[PDB]
CSV table of C-alpha atoms (C1' of nucleotides) in Angstrom, one decimal:
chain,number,residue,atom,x,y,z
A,1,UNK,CA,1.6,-17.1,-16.4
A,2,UNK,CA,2.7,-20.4,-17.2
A,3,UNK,CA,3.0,-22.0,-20.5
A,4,UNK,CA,-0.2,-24.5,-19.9
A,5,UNK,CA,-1.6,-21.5,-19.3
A,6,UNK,CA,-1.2,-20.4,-22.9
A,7,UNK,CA,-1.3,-24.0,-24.4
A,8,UNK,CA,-5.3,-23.4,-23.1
A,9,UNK,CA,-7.8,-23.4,-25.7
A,10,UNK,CA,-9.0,-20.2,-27.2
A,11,UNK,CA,-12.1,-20.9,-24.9
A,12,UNK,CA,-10.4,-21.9,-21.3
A,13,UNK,CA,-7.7,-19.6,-21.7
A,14,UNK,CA,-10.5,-16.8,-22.3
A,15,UNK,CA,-12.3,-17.6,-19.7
A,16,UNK,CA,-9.7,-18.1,-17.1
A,17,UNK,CA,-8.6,-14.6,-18.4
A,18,UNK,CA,-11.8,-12.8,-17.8
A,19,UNK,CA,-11.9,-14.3,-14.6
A,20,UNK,CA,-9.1,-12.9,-13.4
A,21,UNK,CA,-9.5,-9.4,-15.3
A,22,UNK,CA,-13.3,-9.5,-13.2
A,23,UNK,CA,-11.9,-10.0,-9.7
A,24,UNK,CA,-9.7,-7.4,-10.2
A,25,UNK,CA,-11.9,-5.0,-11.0
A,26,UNK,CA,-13.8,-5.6,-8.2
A,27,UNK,CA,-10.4,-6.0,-5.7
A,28,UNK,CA,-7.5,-4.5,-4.7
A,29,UNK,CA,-4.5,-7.3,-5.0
A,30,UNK,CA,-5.0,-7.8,-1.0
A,31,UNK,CA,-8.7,-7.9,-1.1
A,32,UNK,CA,-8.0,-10.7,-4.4
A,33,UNK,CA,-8.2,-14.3,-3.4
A,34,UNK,CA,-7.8,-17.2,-5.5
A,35,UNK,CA,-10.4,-19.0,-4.0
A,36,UNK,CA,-12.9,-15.7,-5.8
A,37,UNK,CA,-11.4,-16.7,-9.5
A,38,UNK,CA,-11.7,-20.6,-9.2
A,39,UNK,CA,-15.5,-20.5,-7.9
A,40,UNK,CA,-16.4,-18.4,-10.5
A,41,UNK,CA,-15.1,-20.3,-12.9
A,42,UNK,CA,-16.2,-23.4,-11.3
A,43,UNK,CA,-12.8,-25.2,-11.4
A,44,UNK,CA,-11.0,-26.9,-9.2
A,45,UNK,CA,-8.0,-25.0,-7.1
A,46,UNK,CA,-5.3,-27.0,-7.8
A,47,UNK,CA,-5.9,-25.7,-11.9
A,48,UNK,CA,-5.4,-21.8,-11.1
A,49,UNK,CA,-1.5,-23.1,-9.8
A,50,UNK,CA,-1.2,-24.9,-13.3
A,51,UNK,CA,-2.1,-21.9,-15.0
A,52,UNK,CA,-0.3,-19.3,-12.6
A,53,UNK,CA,2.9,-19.1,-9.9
A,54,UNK,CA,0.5,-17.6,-7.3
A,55,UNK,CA,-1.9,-14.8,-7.4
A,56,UNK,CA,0.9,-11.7,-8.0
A,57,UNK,CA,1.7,-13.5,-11.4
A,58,UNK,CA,-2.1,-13.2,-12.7
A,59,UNK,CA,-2.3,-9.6,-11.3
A,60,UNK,CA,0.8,-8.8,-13.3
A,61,UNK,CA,-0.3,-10.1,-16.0
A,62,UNK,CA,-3.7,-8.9,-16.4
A,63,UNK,CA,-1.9,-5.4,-15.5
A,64,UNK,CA,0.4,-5.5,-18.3
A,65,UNK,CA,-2.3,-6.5,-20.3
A,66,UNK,CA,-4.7,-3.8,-19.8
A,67,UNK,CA,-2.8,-1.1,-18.5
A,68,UNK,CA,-0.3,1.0,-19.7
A,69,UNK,CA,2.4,3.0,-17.8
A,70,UNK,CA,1.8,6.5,-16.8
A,71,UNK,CA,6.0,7.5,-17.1
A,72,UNK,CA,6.0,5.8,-20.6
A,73,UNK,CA,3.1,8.1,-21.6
A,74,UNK,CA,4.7,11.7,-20.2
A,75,UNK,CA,8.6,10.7,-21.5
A,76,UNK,CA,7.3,9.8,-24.9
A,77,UNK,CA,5.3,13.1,-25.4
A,78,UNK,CA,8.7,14.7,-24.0
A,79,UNK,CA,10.6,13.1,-27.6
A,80,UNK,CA,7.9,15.1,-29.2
A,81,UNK,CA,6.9,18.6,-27.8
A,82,UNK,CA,8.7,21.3,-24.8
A,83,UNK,CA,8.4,20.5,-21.5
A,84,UNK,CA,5.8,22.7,-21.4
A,85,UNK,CA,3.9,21.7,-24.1
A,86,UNK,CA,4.3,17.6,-22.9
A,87,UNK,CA,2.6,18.9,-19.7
A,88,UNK,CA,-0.5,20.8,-21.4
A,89,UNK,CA,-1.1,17.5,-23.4
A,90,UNK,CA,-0.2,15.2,-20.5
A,91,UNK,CA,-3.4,16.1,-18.3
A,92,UNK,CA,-5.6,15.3,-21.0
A,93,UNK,CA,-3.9,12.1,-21.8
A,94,UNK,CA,-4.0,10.9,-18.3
A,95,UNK,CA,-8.0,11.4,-17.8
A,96,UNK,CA,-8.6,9.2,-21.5
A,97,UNK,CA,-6.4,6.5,-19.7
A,98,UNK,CA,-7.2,6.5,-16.2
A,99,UNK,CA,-10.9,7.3,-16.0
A,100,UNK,CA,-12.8,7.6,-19.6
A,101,UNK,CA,-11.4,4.1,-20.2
A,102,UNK,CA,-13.1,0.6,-19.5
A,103,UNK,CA,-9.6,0.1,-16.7
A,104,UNK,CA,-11.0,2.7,-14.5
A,105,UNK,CA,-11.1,0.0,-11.7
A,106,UNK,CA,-7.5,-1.4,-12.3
A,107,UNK,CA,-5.8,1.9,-11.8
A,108,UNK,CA,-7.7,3.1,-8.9
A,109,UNK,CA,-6.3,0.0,-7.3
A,110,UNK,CA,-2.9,0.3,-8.6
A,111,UNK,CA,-3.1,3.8,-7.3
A,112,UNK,CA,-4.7,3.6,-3.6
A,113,UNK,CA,-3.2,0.5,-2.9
A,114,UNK,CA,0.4,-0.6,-4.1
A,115,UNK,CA,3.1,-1.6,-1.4
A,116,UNK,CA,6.7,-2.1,-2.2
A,117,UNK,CA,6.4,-5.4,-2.3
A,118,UNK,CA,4.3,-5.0,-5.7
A,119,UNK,CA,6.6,-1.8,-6.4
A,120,UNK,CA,10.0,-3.8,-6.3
A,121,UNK,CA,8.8,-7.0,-8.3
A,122,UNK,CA,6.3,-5.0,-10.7
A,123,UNK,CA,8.3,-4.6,-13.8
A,124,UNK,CA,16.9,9.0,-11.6
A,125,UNK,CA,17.4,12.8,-11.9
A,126,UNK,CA,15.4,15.2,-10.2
A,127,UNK,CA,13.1,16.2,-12.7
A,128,UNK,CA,11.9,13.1,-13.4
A,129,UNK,CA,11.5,12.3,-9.1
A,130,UNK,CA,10.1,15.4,-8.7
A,131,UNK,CA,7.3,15.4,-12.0
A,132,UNK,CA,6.7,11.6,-11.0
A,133,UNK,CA,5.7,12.6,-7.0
A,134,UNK,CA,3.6,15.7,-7.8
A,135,UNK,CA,1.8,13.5,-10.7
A,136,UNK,CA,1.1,10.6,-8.8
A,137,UNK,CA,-0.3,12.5,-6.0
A,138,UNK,CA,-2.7,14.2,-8.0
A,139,UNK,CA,-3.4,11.4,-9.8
A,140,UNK,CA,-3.8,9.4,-5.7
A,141,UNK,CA,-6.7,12.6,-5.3
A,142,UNK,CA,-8.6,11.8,-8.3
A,143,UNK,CA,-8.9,8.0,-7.4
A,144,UNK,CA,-9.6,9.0,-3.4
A,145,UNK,CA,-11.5,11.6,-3.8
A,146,UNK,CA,-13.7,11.1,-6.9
A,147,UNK,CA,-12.8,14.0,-8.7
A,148,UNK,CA,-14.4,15.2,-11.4
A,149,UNK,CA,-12.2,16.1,-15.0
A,150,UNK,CA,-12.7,19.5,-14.5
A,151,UNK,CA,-10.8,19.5,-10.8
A,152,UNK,CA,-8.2,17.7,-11.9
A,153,UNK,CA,-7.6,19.7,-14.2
A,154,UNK,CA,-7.7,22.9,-11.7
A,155,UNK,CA,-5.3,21.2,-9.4
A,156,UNK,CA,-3.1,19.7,-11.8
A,157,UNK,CA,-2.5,23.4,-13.3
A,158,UNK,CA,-2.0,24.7,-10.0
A,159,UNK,CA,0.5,22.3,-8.9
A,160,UNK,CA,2.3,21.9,-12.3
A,161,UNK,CA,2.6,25.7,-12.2
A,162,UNK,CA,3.6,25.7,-9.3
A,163,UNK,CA,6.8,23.2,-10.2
A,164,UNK,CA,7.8,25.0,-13.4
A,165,UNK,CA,7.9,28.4,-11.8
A,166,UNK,CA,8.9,27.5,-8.8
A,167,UNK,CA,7.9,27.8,-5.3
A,168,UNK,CA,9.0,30.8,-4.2
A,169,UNK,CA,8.1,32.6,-7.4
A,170,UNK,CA,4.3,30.7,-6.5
A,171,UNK,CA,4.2,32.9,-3.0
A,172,UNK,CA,5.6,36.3,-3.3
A,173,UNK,CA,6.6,38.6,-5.8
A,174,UNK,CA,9.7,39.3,-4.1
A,175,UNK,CA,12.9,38.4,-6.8
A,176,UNK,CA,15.6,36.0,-6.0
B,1,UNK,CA,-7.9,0.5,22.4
B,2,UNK,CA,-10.5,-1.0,24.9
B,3,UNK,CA,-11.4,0.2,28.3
B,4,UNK,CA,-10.8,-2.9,29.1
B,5,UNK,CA,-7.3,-2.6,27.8
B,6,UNK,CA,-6.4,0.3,30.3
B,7,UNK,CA,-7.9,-1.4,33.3
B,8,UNK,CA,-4.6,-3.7,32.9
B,9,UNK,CA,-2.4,-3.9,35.7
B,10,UNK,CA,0.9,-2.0,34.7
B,11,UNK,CA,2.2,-5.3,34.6
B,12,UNK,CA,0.3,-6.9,31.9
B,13,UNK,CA,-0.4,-3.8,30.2
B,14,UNK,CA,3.1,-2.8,29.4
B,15,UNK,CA,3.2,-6.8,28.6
B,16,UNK,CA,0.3,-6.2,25.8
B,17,UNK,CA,1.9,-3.4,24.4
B,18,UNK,CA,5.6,-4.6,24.0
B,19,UNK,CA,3.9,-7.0,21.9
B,20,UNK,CA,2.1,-5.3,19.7
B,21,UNK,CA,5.1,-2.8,19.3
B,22,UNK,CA,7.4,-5.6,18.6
B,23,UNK,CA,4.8,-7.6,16.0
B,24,UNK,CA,4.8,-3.9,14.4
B,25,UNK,CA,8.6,-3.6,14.4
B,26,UNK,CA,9.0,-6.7,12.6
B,27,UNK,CA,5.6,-6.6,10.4
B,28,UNK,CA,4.1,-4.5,8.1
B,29,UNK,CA,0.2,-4.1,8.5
B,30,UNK,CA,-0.4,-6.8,6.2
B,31,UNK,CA,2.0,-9.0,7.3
B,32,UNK,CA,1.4,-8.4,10.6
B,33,UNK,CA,-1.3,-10.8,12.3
B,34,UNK,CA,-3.1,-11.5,15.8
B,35,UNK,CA,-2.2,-15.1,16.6
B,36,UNK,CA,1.7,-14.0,16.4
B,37,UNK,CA,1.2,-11.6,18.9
B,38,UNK,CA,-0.9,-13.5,21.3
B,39,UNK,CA,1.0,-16.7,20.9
B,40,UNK,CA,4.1,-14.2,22.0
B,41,UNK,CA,2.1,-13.6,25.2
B,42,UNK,CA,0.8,-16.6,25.4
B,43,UNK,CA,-2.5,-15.4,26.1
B,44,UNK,CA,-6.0,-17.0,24.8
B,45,UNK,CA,-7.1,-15.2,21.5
B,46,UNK,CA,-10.2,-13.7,22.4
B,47,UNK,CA,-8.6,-12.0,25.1
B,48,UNK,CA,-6.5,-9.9,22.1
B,49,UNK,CA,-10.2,-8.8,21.1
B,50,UNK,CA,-11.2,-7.8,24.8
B,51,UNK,CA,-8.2,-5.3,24.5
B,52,UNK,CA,-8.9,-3.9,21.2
B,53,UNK,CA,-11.4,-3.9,18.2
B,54,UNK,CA,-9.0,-5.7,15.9
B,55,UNK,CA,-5.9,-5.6,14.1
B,56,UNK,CA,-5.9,-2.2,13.1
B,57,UNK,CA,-7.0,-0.6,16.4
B,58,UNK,CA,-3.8,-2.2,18.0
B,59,UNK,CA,-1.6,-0.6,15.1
B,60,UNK,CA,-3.1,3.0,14.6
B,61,UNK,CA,-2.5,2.5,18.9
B,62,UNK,CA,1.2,1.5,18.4
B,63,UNK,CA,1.5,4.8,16.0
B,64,UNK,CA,0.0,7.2,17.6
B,65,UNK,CA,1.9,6.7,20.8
B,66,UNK,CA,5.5,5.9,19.1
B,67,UNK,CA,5.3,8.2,15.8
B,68,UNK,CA,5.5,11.3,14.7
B,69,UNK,CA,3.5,13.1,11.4
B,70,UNK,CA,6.2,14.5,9.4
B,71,UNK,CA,3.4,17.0,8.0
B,72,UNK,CA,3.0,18.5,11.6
B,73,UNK,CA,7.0,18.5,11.8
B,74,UNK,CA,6.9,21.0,8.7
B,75,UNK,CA,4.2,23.2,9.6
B,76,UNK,CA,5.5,23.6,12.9
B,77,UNK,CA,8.6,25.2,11.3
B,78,UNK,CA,6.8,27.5,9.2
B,79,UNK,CA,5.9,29.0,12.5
B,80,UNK,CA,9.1,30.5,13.2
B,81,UNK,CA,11.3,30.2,10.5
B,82,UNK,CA,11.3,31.7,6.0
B,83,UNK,CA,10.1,28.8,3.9
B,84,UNK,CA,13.9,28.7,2.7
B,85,UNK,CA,14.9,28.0,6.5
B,86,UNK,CA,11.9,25.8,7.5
B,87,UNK,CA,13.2,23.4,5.0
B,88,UNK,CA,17.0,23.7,5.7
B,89,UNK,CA,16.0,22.6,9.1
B,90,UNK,CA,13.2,20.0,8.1
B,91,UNK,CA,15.7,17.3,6.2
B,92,UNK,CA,17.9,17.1,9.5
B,93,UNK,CA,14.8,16.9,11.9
B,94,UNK,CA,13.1,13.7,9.2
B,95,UNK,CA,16.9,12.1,9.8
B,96,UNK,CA,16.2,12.6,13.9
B,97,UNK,CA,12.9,11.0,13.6
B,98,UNK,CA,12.9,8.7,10.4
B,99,UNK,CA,16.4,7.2,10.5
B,100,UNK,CA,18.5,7.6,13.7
B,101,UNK,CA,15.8,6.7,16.5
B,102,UNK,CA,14.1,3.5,17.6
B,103,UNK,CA,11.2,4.1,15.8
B,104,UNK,CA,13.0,3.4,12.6
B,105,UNK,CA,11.0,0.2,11.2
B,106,UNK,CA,7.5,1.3,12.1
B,107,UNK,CA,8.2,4.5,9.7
B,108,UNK,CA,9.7,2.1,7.4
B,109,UNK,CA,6.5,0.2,7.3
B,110,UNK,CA,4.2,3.6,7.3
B,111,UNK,CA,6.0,4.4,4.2
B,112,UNK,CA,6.7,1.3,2.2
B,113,UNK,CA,3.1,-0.3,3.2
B,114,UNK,CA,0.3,2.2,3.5
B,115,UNK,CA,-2.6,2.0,1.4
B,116,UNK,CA,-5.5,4.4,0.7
B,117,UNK,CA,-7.4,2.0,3.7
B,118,UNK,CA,-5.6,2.6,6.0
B,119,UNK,CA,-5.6,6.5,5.0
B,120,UNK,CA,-8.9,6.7,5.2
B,121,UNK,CA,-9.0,5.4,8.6
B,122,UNK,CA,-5.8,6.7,10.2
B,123,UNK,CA,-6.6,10.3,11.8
B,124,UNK,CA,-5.5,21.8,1.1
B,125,UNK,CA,-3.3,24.6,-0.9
B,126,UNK,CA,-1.3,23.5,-3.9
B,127,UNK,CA,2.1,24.6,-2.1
B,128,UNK,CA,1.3,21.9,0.5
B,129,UNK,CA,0.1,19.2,-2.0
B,130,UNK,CA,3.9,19.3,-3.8
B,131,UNK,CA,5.9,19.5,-0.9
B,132,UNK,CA,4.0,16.7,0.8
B,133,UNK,CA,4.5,14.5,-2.8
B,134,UNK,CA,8.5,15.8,-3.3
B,135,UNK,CA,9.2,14.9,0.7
B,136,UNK,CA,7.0,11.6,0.9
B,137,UNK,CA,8.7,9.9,-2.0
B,138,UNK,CA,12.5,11.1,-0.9
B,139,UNK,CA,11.2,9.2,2.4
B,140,UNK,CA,10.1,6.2,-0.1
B,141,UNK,CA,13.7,6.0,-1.3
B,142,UNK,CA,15.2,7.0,2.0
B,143,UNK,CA,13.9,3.3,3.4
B,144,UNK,CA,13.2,1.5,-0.4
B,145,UNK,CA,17.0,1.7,-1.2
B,146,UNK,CA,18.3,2.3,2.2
B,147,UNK,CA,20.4,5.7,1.4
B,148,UNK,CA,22.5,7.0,3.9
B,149,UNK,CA,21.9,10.2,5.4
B,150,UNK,CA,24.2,11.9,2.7
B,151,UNK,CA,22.4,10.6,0.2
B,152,UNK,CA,19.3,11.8,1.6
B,153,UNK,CA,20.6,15.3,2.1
B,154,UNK,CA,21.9,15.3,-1.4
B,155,UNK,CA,18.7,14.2,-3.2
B,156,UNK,CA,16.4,16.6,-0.4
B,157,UNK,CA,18.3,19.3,-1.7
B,158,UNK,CA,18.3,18.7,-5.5
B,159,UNK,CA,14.6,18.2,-5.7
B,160,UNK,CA,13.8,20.9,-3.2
B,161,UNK,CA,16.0,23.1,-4.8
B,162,UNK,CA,14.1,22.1,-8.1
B,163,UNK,CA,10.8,23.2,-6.4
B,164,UNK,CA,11.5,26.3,-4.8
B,165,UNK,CA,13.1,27.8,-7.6
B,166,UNK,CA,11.7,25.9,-10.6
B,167,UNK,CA,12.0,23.5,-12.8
B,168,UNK,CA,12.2,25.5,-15.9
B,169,UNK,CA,15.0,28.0,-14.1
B,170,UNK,CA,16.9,24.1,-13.4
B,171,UNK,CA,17.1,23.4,-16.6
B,172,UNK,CA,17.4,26.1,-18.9
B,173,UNK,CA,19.0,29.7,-18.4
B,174,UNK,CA,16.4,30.9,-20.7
B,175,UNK,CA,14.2,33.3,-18.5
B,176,UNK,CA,10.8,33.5,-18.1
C,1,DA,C1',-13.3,-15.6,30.1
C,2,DT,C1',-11.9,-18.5,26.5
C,3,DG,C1',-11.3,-22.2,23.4
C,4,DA,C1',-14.0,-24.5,20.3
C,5,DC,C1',-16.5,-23.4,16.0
C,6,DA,C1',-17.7,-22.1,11.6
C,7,DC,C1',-15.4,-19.7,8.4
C,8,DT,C1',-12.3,-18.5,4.7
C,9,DG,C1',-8.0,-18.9,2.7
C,10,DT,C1',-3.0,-21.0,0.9
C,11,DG,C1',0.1,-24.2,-1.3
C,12,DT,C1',1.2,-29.1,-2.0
C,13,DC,C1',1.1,-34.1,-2.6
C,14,DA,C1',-0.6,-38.6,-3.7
C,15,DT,C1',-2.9,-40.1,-7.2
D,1,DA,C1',-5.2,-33.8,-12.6
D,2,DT,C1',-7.3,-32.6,-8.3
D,3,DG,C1',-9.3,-32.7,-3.9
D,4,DA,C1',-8.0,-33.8,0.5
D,5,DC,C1',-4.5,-32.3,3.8
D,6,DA,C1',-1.8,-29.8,6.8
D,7,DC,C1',-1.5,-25.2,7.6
D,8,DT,C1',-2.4,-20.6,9.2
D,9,DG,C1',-5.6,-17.1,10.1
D,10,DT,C1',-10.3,-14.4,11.7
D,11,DG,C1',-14.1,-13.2,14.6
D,12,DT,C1',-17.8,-15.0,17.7
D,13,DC,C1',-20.5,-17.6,21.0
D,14,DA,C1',-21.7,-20.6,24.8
D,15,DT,C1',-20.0,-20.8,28.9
DNA sequence: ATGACACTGTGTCAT
DNA sequence: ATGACACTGTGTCAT
């Protein structure tokens, strides 16, 4: 944001804030028009470009704000606990962020709908590229889907298993 | 498409459709937009809508008849060849199709600019869910960083190799 | 058939 | 500051 934004009063710069936070809840950053936050707000258009570049500098700032980073949350258990350990305690940490938290609705968007274009402005070894895709597709699911904690669970152990032991091991009983 | 669209003379069918495909070439989805492709043609704008329901009936068009699904590329495989072999093969056949054919920037745009509405509209074993994640997002970084096709083959067979044999057996000799 | 209409939306500029 | 302006865009309706 901008620094009028910040030189708001506590009141405006709350309720500017809230506005924001409320149409994305309720939209995806294409479905997310300006035109939504400045009715609602009652103000006129010309003030959300005072407070704001364009509409991709309020949605990255209310995601900053409220959401956190699903990497930073798996590498920081990793300083902690085995690999093994960081991914029995990784499940459970993803469903108390993504789903039993008031952000539900700003991480199923970030989740179903994300371009690069957000991907290269939003601010590399095989472990990390492989963990990442399997996570974020099971993580895809339980937006798309709608599942519950208990099949997300299921899958993720099926599919984690599946990358720890391998493949091949997953399949056949046959030895390399 | 329309009936209405494949009553066109080959003439100004094959007209229609060079447009589209070239406003696809040059657009992703959401950038892409009807007025650029009838002011191309220079053609009234409800006749666009005569030819097809709307944007996204034009697109999922342009797909269907100029793209493959990499999925159905795999399985296809598995029909005649070891899991080991099906995806030795699979890497060069995604370079065929993703990378060194005309078809190039509409895959680019199916990967880099897909959301969760167009999956829903565009027409279930863990082994499949993590080979579908591990292969999509080497694709992602195939076109997001533009690799060349050693680079591609190098990373394909790191995380692969990660998969089939494990991720615990690549990063400790400590067995199971 | 089609192009004008009623919309909805963006970003800027004169004030 | 702000709201009118110049744009660009959609989908429909009277013809």
């Amino acid at each position: 944001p901008k620094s009028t934004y910040f030189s708001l009063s506590d009141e405006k710069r709350n309720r500017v804030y809230d506005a924001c936070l409320n149409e994305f809840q309720t939209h995806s950053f294409h479905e997310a028009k300006i035109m939504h936050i400045v009715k609602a707000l009652d103000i006129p258009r010309g003030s959300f470009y005072q407070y704001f570049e364009d509409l991709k500098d309020a949605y990255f700032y209310v995601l900053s704000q409220e959401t956190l980073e699903i990497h930073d949350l798996f590498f920081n258990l990793l300083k902690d606990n085995s690999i093994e350990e960081s991914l029995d305690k990784y499940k459970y940490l993803l469903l108390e962020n993504l789903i039993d938290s008031p952000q539900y609705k700003l991480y199923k968007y970030r989740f179903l709908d994300w371009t690069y274009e957000l991907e290269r402005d939003w601010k590399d070894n095989p472990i990390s590229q492989v963990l990442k895709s399997v996570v974020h597709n099971l993580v895809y699911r339980l937006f798309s889907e709608n599942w519950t904690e208990k099949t997300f669970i299921e899958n993720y152990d099926k599919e984690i298993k599946l990358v720890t032991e391998g493949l091949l091991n997953y399949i056949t009983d046959r030895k390399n």
